[PDB]
DNA sequence: ATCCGAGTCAGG
DNA sequence: CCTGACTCGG
């Protein structure tokens with residue numbers, strides 16, 4: 023047991039201009055949830071306050087909003103939003119222990135202070151699972167244990183602040199935490215709290231048609247299958263297809279036989295049920311995930327949806343979006359995209375405005391690779407897909423049929439991570455002999471992409487890690503693995519990580535430089551979303567002319583590469599219409 | 602119950 | 614290559 027004042031009230035010696043602060047949201051989704059406890063640690067001691075009391079105090083609430091009071095926490099963003107929900111603001115966070123651990127070694131998957139502490143040999147603090155538990159397991163314990171815990175954390179944060187910073191500084195990532203991640207964290211905070219408005223009525227009439235649509239196919243499947251079965255269980259389905267209907271087994275999952283859309287395109291010719299199955303899956307994924315899914319989570323009063331961008335999960339520096347995931351709304355098949363029509367501004371007479379990097383990930387290859395061909399393609403603003411098709415067929419700026427392009431494109435999608443001939447051949451539905459025969463041609467057509475791939479794999483061998491434009495790391499012990507396929511995975515990570523990685527650094531940065539301008543220019547615009555390479559804003563309809571310059575200007579100039587980045591922008595009265 | 606793992610597919 | 618949500622079913 024470790025002692026601390028167990029406060030009933032706020033003494034001012036809790037308001038020192040530097041403290042580790044802990045603000046416990048024990049709910050798994052932080053949006054509008056109970057704050058269960060608050061521990062503060064400072065030069066004057068270690069204190070515990072109950073939220074009810076604490077949150078009422080104009081003295082405390084004041085200290086919180088003060089950017090001159092420096093706090094140190096773990097996942098300030100969790101506390102930030104939870105507090106924004108209470109109309110309380112949180113400023114002057116100087117060190118976030120979650121973001122730090124995450125830059126040191128994202129693979130450790132640090133989810134709580136206990137994890138962060140292992141890293142630096144500190145152990146007088148307990149995991150979350152130990153105090154709370156797993157599933158229907160997780161519960162809020164009594165104050166005695168709670169106080170003890172929130173303090174032990176806060177204590178650790180105070181303690182680990184400089185051990186952590188010293189390794190970042192040694193690692194060459196001091197300005198990644200300070201200038202990049204922490205600034206962004208605030209920004210995501212606002213974004214998640216702003217929310218995006220959904221048109222629940224249109225979502226309702228989309229679902230309405232899809233059930234009638236779906237009933238229909240369902241029946242047809244059962245008709246031609248000869249019997250009923252749960253189509254969704256592919257274990258049950260394969261039995262219908264490859265046993266009772268006697269069909270060729272072409273691909274195979276590690277368990278039994280495979281029914282991935284890839285195999286079905288191939289089985290189509292073989293029997294009329296095949297395409298009915300594909301239709302059924304597509305229609306059903308809309309309804310399950312983008313109708314019943316979203317509608318399950320609009321906030322009923324405001325009609326908005328509040329995502330959580332997880333700044334500290336991905337192994338390569340992307341963000342992720344959870345519950346719901348606004349980073350995978352349909353856009354590819356035309357009927358899918360209609361969903362986007364349900365994403366509307368939150369103010370009458372405002373517009374969604376959306377801008378994105380053209381080929382960001384490739385452009386980064388070009389810059390990191392220092393291949394001449396690719397650098398020139400981007401500098402002359404050539405349609406990079408069209409130039410690719412040319413180079414792999416050795417043909418003209420018009421002898422490119424549309425199919426030669428669906429092919430060139432797919433290379434550019436995989437050459438960002440050393441795609442396998444086998445792997446490629448899958449997406450393209452071709453013979454593996456042709457897959458590598460396009461690969462072969464790409465490489466002699468862009469042999470600076472070849473070197474890089476050679477080189478990066480060997481730097482990974484030397485250093486045990488790769489890095490990115492802004493010095494994010496990724497360790498890769500499996501690089502020297504005994505085992506062909508494991509060494510191989512690790513070798514594509516070896517080469518792809520600096521690409522995904524910089525691409526993400528660059529946009530995270532664009533977002534900071536953006537908030538920065540909008541705030542100076544007194545503008546009403548604010549970011550709603552990030553989808554890996556686009557930004558989505560809502561602004562007053564009288565503000566587009568500006569954003570059309572501003573947003574591209576700031577995005578393009580976010581960093582400086584041996585290629586010019588390229589941005590596209592569109593705005594409409596909905597997401598669908600900004601395309 | 603309740604957890605986890607694969608599967609499939611939506612996006613990058 | 615990097616995710617996540619929904620789904621069955623060991």
Ligand SMILES: Nc1nc2c(ncn2[C@H]2C[C@H](O)[C@@H](COP(=O)(O)OP(=O)(O)OP(=O)(O)O)O2)c(=O)[nH]1
Pocket residue numbers: 380381407435555613
């Ligand atoms: N990794 C991956 N990303 C894809 C794939 N297909 C589409 N994308 C995503 C990644 C890009 O950020 C985004 C670019 O949009 P498009 O697919 O329409 O390509 P783009 O507009 O650059 O070319 P286009 O103008 O359509 O000829 O799409 C794929 O097969 N793999």
Ligand SMILES: [Ca+2]
Pocket residue numbers: none
């Ligand atoms: Ca395009």
Ligand SMILES: [Ca+2]
Pocket residue numbers: 378555556
């Ligand atoms: Ca895109």
